[PDB]
Design a protein around this ligand. Structure first.
Ligand code: ZN
Ligand code: ZN
Length: 221
């Protein structure tokens, strides 16, 4: 009564996990995150929505011989953070920016056990980089960059065709943030949005255009 968790190889050492929720007005919405393999260590880039799918995901990798070293959540909404509590319960390190952890707390959610400040953060040196482009979809949204394969996980900041719900957005800042992100990751081979298909670096430009339009629409009565 709700489509099963998918796990699909995207590139060498990189898998996309897709979990599903019904969202009022939007239908059955896929949520994409990654699993990144560094030698025999696995890192979750976003959790699924639920504890149950987070556990399915972890078990798939552990069964195949990988050690779950950590998760990083790209923003505070539950499509990035739903599994943090379960991971914490299993003593799997969970990561989020300081600002994401603040907004988890404000939202009455379980926090990541580890936090980081600043604009650039290496989760794994030379392998998994976290970048804060500025506010957009949410105040805290970050992207995750995999330098070896030139893969950008955009999370819910990358919105090539429409912005989604602006309830927690900073629409005034989003164009400036999008310009920064576009300027920094023109090199991306694959850009992975949360809620639409994988594309290339062109999704950075499309997101900027959407942000610009959305800011314009915000200024109409
Ligand atoms: Zn969100
Ligand atoms: Zn989302």
């Amino acid at each position: 009564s709700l489509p099963d968790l998918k796990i699909e190889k995207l590139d060498e050492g990189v898998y996309v996990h897709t979990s599903f929720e019904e969202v009022n007005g939007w239908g059955v919405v896929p949520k994409h995150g990654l699993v990144v393999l560094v030698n025999a260590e696995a890192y979750l880039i976003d959790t699924p929505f639920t504890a149950k799918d987070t556990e399915k995901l972890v078990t798939w990798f552990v069964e195949r011989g990988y050690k779950i070293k950590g998760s990083i959540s790209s923003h505070f909404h539950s499509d990035s953070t739903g599994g943090i509590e379960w991971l914490n319960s299993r003593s799997i390190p969970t990561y989020a920016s300081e600002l994401t952890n603040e907004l988890l707390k404000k939202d009455g959610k379980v926090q990541a056990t580890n936090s980081f400040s600043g604009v650039n953060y290496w989760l794994v040196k030379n392998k998994i980089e976290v970048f804060y482009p500025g506010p957009g979809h949410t105040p805290d949204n970050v992207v995750v960059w995999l330098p070896e394969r030139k893969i950008l996980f955009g999370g819910c900041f990358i919105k090539p065709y429409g912005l989604g719900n602006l309830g927690d957005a900073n629409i005034e800042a989003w164009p400036k943030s999008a310009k920064l992100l576009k300027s920094k990751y023109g090199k991306a081979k694959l850009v992975v949005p949360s809620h639409s298909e994988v594309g290339d670096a062109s999704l950075l430009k499309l997101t900027l255009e959407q942000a610009v339009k959305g800011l314009n629409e915000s200024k109409k009565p």
